[PDB]
């Protein structure tokens, strides 16, 4: 349904853009980002593109009326008890896309997509904080979400809603901003995919993404230490020398054996080996 | 440093007294810290909270050499036992050290501090008291002197490892935290007060050599502990020879007799399992594309598996009675399509039922029996995926589903007798000076040769064999070619 | 088999952009190459490929060169084929049944050195993890020297490129026989074997199917490069 959804919404906004010619990519700046009308998904598009050009209107009530059944359960807090993990899985993917292709950061059909996840993003600022907080985010609002459907109803899918949460939460893997972002890159310029199967690439990877997340796989081994040794040190071959020092003899002899015993003793001093590193 | 005290020789001893005046002071970064007592000496731990860890050892200390150690107290020395009377051989004044490590094999009573610890325990015996936070320990085998955990007040979990120790040595008691030996020196866990146990809920971790992994849970009325995670991959490193097939491993455990956390979780291998003891079900997840999976049934457990799209899912013979009933959930696309069936095992007879959303087949082997559900995550079964039952009637499912009625009644798909099995199945009009192969395999002697005519008109073979012996043509069961 | 004849002929293409056609014949395969010579350039003259396999024992075929087949370049045309040959395809059936048809001339089945170098060879190998456009063409790969690897003729009657192993299923079509040693095989199989330390050039890589876990490589054979690596970056052994 997002499929279709995203699909809908570009064609939407593309023969809304056909008024201005395409001009490579980056131009049109996507510089107004309102949400007009809540109900019909009045999203204002001043698609500058160099000149005086505002598309204001656009109907996207596709994935606004989801936000507006998520305010609904919302609000639902103390006065249901249903348990609702599907809108769950639905949450941590609009979320977890909206950063994956904030931190991705031209064809208009990526450019445009980064405007509905964006549109998304600031969507979920406008019902899930009610009031206006400027330090207002995204993953305290799904944690409190998860928290109360915990408390309503508790189980496997109380502790599912803890992990996917406190894993969005965590800033995404190196790895997953990493090599599955350059490898859909790789897939998509110097391979020559259309539209449809670049698209379903980045669906795929989000929510696998987020499926690997909110489930556990992983092994712990401490490593082992035992029997660290240095050198023998036996201790007697050091300020032992006085002991044949003291002979009643001449002191020249006792002399020359203190200077040997200095000698030796700083001959070797500092030994390194750079090559093993100690 | 040097090793400067390592026996209870009195010249070690005489050196050790003499060089305890000396000073060390240490001043580590962040990226780690790892220190190590030369066994005399004045030392000054300069170490920072930012750091990971920081290791204070003291496996240079000599063998059964009793010590004591608290981490919470910043100065502290260590009575050495010299003929007749206790010297100061250690002068300690720690900043930054998270990590108590003991002796090799001598005694040892370490404390903690409030923060995260974690303790190489001696192999010699001994009392260890933890701290708080988050501590683990590390504990060889074969101890001297049953140990004694004593729980912290403000400590909120405890993981604890044996990386020398099977799960095969180790026996459950009920209602016992504690970890008890078959033949040692077993080891009690005790908190300051006998009353908060039930705070350790998910708390109490403890792993094993051979990979299994130990937690505690609550039962309506006590504490106890079972299992939840399992390593298969470190089995099979510790027993090469038994077969990497979880039920096996899971019926092993259930002949020690420990009991089970309410989901186990199988990691290792290429897939993973989510076993459950109370709904008595074993499924697997796969997630690997065009991957071949042997799917067996047992008697212990019901077996379903899920797959991805592409992949294709074997049947092998049955080979004791009373199998529970599997099931295959399919995850194929279009045009990405399954052979989820590979029926070449004991197709004798096999039939089927259409439920609601779903495929009941019933393969019955000459004696033994099975019962499989074909379903998908789609709600309407895909009709692109390949049944297979004889080595040349691959079908497909949109066919059988077709077949099948909607009242639930059952319908013969296949049964033996009716023909042969048809080895290759060639067309008269694709045979017009063409040239046959069959491959040889051994014994069988059922190599057949189904010629299909479907023409309309009679035809006329005139050909010779180049490598054979033809053994007449089948008319009817039980009836001499 | 013994032919290996060529025929070349001149075609007047609209007024005066004349082309030349070679016509080759391989068993059931009439092979044609369409060179323009001057329609571009005095050089790099574009070259052209199809077949007209005889299929279902049929005796008339026409060629019209504009439905059958399209304009490929001599990689591309392997490839077409390797393709073709992977699939149950009518062409590399017929291929199949005539090559076993030359096996038994004689009475026995015996394969001659003169037979393999009018065909190619076929392997295929399974990849527990393939990476996505790692191998390139003019790359070179080896043949592992601890195991003395082997190669077929025919892949129809011998099920040898079904599905088999999980992972990414990877077929290889070597044009060069010459030098590999016949095998003792019994009388209706055929296979062939490949000398270890044995050097292969890469040439045209496709992937096209890497969805549907199925990648085509066909190879050309050298003699000793012993340059650089030639296994996958993973480390699963090739030629499996």
Known sequence: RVKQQLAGVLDTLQQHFQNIPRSSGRHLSVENIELADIGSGRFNLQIRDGETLHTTSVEVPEVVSRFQKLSTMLSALPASGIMDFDLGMSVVGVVQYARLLQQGHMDIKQLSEATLGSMIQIAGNKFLNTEGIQGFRLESAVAEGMRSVATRTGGTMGK??????????????????????????????????????????????????????????????????????????????????????????????????????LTDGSKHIVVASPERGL | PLRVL??????????????????????????????QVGGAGYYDIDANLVAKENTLSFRGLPEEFPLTFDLSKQTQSVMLKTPDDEVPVMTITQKGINTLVGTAAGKDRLIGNDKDNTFHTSSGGGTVISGGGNNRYIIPRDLKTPLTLTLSSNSVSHEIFLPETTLAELKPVAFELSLIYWAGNNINVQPEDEAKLNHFAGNFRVHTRDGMTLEAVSRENGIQLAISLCDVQRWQAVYPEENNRPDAILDRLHDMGWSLTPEVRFQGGETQVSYDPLTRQLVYQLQARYSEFQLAGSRHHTTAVTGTPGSRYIIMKPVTTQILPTQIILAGDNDHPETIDLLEASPVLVEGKKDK????????????????????????????????????????????????PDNGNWVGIFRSGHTPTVNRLENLMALNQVMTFLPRVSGSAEQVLCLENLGGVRKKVEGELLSGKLKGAWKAEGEPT | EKYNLSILSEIPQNNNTVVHSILRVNGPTMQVRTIDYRGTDENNPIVSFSDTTFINGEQMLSYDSHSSGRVYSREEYMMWELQQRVSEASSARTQDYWLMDAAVRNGEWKITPELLRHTPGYIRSTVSKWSRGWLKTGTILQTPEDRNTDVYLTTIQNNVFSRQGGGYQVYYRIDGMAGADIADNAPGETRCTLRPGTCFEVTSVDERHYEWNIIYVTLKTCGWSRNGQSKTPNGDNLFN
């Open chain 1, 160 to 261: 599912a809603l803890s992990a996917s949460a406190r894993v969005l939460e965590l800033p995404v893997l190196e790895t997953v901003l990493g090599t599955w972002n350059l490898y859909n890159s790789v897939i998509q310029l110097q391979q020559a995919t259309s539209y449809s199967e670049t698209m379903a690439a980045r669906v795929q990877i989000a929510f696998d993404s987020i499926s690997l997340g909110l489930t556990a796989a992983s092994v712990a081994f401490p490593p082992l230490i035992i029997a660290t040794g240095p050198i023998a040190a036996i201790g007697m071959g050091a300020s032992s020398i006085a002991r044949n020092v003291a002979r009643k003899e001449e002191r020249h002899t006792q002399w020359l054996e203190y200077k040997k015993f």
């Open chain 2, 6 to 35: 390592s026996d209870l020789t009195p010249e070690c001893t005489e050196q050790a007294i003499s060089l305890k005046d000396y000073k060390f002071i240490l001043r580590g970064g962040s990226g780690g810290l790892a220190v």
């Open chain 2, 357 to 404: 959303n779903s495929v009941i087949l019933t393969i019955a082997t000459i004696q033994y029996s099975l019962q499989l559900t074909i379903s998908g995550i789609e709600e309407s079964l895909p009709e692109t995926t390949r049944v297979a039952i004889q080595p040349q009637d691959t079908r497909l499912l949109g066919d059988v589903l077709r077949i099948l």
